[PDB]
Amino acid sequence: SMRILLSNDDGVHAPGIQTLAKALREFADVQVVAPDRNRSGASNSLTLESSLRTFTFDNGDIAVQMGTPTDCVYLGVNALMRPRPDIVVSGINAGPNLGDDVIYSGTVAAAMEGRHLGFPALAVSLNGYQHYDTAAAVTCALLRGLSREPLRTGRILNVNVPDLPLAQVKGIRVTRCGSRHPADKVIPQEDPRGNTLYWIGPPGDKYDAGPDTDFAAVDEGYVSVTPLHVDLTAHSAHDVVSDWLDSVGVGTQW
Amino acid sequence: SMRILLSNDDGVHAPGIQTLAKALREFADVQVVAPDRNRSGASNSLTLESSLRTFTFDNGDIAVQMGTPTDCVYLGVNALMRPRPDIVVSGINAGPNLGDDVIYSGTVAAAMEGRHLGFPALAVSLNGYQHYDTAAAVTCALLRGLSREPLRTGRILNVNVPDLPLAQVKGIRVTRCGSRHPADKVIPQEDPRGNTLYWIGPPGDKYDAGPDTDFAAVDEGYVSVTPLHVDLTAHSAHDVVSDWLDSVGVGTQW
Ligand SMILES: [Mg+2]
Ligand SMILES: [Mg+2]
Numbered sequence: 001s002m003r004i005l006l007s008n009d010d011g012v013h014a015p016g017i018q019t020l021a022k023a024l025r026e027f028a029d030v031q032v033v034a035p036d037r038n039r040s041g042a043s044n045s046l047t048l049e050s051s052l053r054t055f056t057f058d059n060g061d062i063a064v065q066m067g068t069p070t071d072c073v074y075l076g077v078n079a080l081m082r083p084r085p086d087i088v089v090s091g092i093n094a095g096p097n098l099g100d101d102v103i104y105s106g107t108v109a110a111a112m113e114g115r116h117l118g119f120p121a122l123a124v125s126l127n128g129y130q131h132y133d134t135a136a137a138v139t140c141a142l143l144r145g146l147s148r149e150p151l152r153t154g155r156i157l158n159v160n161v162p163d164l165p166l167a168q169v170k171g172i173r174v175t176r177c178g179s180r181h182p183a184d185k186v187i188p189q190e191d192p193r194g195n196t197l198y199w200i201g202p203p204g205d206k207y208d209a210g211p212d213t214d215f216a217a218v219d220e221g222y223v224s225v226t227p228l229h230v231d232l233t234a235h236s237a238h239d240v241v242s243d244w245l246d247s248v249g250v251g252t253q254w
Numbered sequence: 255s256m257r258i259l260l261s262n263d264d265g266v267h268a269p270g271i272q273t274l275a276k277a278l279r280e281f282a283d284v285q286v287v288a289p290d291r292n293r294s295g296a297s298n299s300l301t302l303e304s305s306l307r308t309f310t311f312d313n314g315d316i317a318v319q320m321g322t323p324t325d326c327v328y329l330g331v332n333a334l335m336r337p338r339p340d341i342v343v344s345g346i347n348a349g350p351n352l353g354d355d356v357i358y359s360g361t362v363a364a365a366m367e368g369r370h371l372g373f374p375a376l377a378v379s380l381n382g383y384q385h386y387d388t389a390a391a392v393t394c395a396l397l398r399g400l401s402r403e404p405l406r407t408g409r410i411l412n413v414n415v416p417d418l419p420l421a422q423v424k425g426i427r428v429t430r431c432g433s434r435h436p437a438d439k440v441i442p443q444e445d446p447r448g449n450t451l452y453w454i455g456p457p458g459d460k461y462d463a464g465p466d467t468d469f470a471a472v473d474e475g476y477v478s479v480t481p482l483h484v485d486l487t488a489h490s491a492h493d494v495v496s497d498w499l500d501s502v503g504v505g506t507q508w
Contacts, residue, residue, distance in 0.1 A: 043298035043324075044357045051443055051451035070297075070358075075452055079440040102486050103366075104298045104324075112357065116436040145502035152498075154491035172505030174496045177487045182370040186333040189305055197305035198329055223505060227495045229488035230354050233431045237408035237481030242428045244406070248399030250392075251426020251477060 002028040002147060005081055005114065007072040008091030009107035011038045012063040015132055017091030020124070021061075023136040024089070027144070033076040034091065035106075036063040042106035044113070046070045054080065069110035077114070087146070088114030092135045093125040096160060098214045099178035100203070102228070108158055112230060115155040119146050123156070123228075127218050128163025135161040138172075138223050154227035160214060161223050172223035178213035180204035256282045256401050257337070259330045259368070262345025263323040263360030265292045266315055270386055271345030274378070275315070277390040278343070282397065286315035287330035288345065293323060296360035300324045308334070323360040327367035342368025343397075346389045347379040350414050352468045353432040355457060356482070365410050366484055373400055374409045377482075381472050382417030389415040392426075392477055408481035414468060416475050429478040432467035434458040 004024055008017040012034035024030045035042075036055065045068045052075060053065035062080055064072050073088050090110040097105040107123055114121035122142060126135045138161050162169055181204035188196045209215035217224035245251055258278055262271040266288035278284050289296075290309065299322045306329060307319040316334060318326045327342055344364035351359040361377050368375030376396060380389045392415050412431075416423050439455025463469035471478035499505055 041300050041302040043296075043300075043363070045297045045299040046295040046358050046454060048295035048454060049292060051441075051453040053449070053451055068299075071454070074437075074454060075440065077436075078438045078455075079442075079452060100484070103484055104300060106299075108486075109297070141504040145498075145504045149498070149502055151495065153494040154488055156488075157495070158486075172499060174492060174499065176489065176492075177485060183328075184332045186329065188333070195307070197307050198333055199305050200300060200302060200325070200328060225495060225499070226486075227488045227491040228486045229491070230357055230486075231431055231433070232356050232482045232484070234408055234410075234481040234483040235430065237483075238428055238430075240407040241405065241411070241479060241481050244403070245426055245428065245479070248403050250395040250399055 003083065003086045004028045004030045005073060005076045005085035005088035006030050006032045006091050007034050007069055007076065007088065007110040008093060009040050009069045009110065010094055011035055012061055014038065014094065016094050019132045019136055020091045020139065023140055031081045032061040033072045033080050034063055035067050035069060035072055036065055040106050041104065042068045042109065043104050044070050044109040069106040070113050073110050073113040085117060087117055087119035088121045089139065090123040092132055094129050095125065096127045096218065097123065097125045098160060098218065100180050102158060102177055111156050111158065112228065115230060120151055120155050120157050123158045125160045126163055127160060130163050131165055134164065134166045134169060137166050156228035158226040158228050159223060160218055162218055162221050164221065168221065169223060170221040172225055173217040175214040175217050175224045175226045176212045177226060178209045178215040179207045181207050257340045258282050258284045259327065259335055259339035259342045260284050260286045260345060261288050261323055261326045261330065261342065261364040262347060263289065263293050263296055263364060264348055265289050266317045268345065268348065270348055270380065273386040274346045274390055274393060277394055285335045287326045287334055288317060289321050289323060289326060290317040290319055293360055295358060296322045296363065297358045298324055298363040298366065323364035324367055327364045339371060341371055341373040342375040343393065344377045346386050348383045349379065350381045350472065351379045351412065352414060352472065353434050356412065356431060362412055362482065369409050369484065374405050374411055376411050376413060378413045378415065380415050380417055384417050385419060388418060388420045388423065391420050410482040412480040412482050414472050414478045416472055418475060422475065423477065424475045426477040426479060427471040429468040429471050429480050430466055431480055432460060432469040433462040435461045
């Protein structure tokens with residue numbers, strides 16, 4: 001019987017995470033360890049300068065004080081949940097995590113943090129705010145599915161679900177991350193004393209959102225499943241960087 | 255003429271950034287934009303629900319008040335530094351960023367924000383903190399030559415410098431990222447009121463530290479340079495996931 005570490009990114013009381021927990025407690029033992037306040041825009045952010053305070057609740061749900069999504073699952077796996085989870089699922093998130101985004105996503109990061117357990121970790125995001133209903137069903141399918149048969153390759157599955165009633169989601173689709181044009185907008189806004197403060201503001205237009213992409217999938221009406229890894233090496237850049245090095249003679253006398 | 259945007263993640267006052275600033279500033283035009291405090295572990299996190307305030311010191315360095323490394327370089331290239339920088343150098347970090355430490359590193363995050371400039375972003379990490387001089391020599395050497403001859407491919411370089419006297423470092427190796435075992439340590443500490451607080455342990459043991467890894471290079475006394483990209487998609491796992499979805503009948507009814 002599956003042991004589930006359920007975290008998320010929107011906080012221990014987000015409709016997203018609570019819904020998923022009810023659905024999952026139907027066939028698995030779930031233990032929630034989530035951050036205490038919506039703070040999305042954390043990435044694989046990790047509290048290193050300070051220790052972490054824990055708070056447990058009425059049920060058994062833990063919230064990490066000021067804790068980051070990676071904070072949560074990390075504490076969850078090596079201290080807080082015992083016996084250890086078999087999987088971590090990163091609880092239904094209010095809003096997409098597609099393309100370039102994924103690198104900055106706290107919800108993707110919680111999943112990435114469970115890349116080492118018996119089962120692949122699931123990140124789950126709704127594109128919108130209404131049909132949490134649907135994302136739960138999708139996750140359960142994915143989960144019963146792992147339980148009859150283990151997946152031999154891919155330790156992070158990044159799922160996004162369209163904001164449509166289950167009956168209208170056309171299927172699911174294995175995808176690749178898309179990309180936007182480089183973001184560059186900064187919105188200045190000035191404080192009552194004259195000084196300029198800056199907002200980061202909105203991401204670039206969609207660049208590669210062709211047929212193979214997670215963007216196209218969701219746009220079409222499919223669950224989009226992207227397998228993620230954690231090796232950022234640009235392997236094909238290799239010889240070029242080496243020729244360069246030799247060409248200009250850094251690291252060499254000759 | 256070479257306009258450098260100089261960030262780091264240990265904070266604008268760290269000896270790694272300051273020593274780098276000084277070395278660059280005698281053949282290059284430099285602007286420091288960095289966090290106001292030690293922000294190690296910050297990964298790609300960014301401030302989205304708040305505006306950011308800056309502070310300028312008399313030497314012109316700029317700090318982003320509660321800014322993340324990412325916050326800093328985004329604001330650096332797009333608002334703060336005029337005219338735009340030619341390059342982003344992410345200041346000499348105290349401690350290595352090797353293997354999968356990369357997904358958590360604020361140092362590399364700062365460079366990832368440099369992705370779209372003329373020259374490739376440089377992330378520079380020292381494996382200790384005796385010899386910042388050493389990392390400086392390297393970075394300066396990387397930067398010249400870069401300005402003698404462009405790098406035809408690869409937008410982000412993850413540079414790790416052994417913690418030795420320059421004379422003792424054997425050379426340079428273009429490398430690939432290694433990987434660690436799961437981390438499992440959670441160092442507990444009691445509150446003065448008796449409550450268990452949790453500190454996040456260290457990075458796990460080197461696991462893949464093979465012949466051509468970033469680990470191997472540093473341990474043997476070489477500078478490691480790794481080309482990095484931002485695509486999280488595990489492409490080679492595509493068909494396996496696709497066969498698994500079909501084998502389990504999720505997203506098809508037959
Ligand atoms: Mg969120
Ligand atoms: Mg640091």
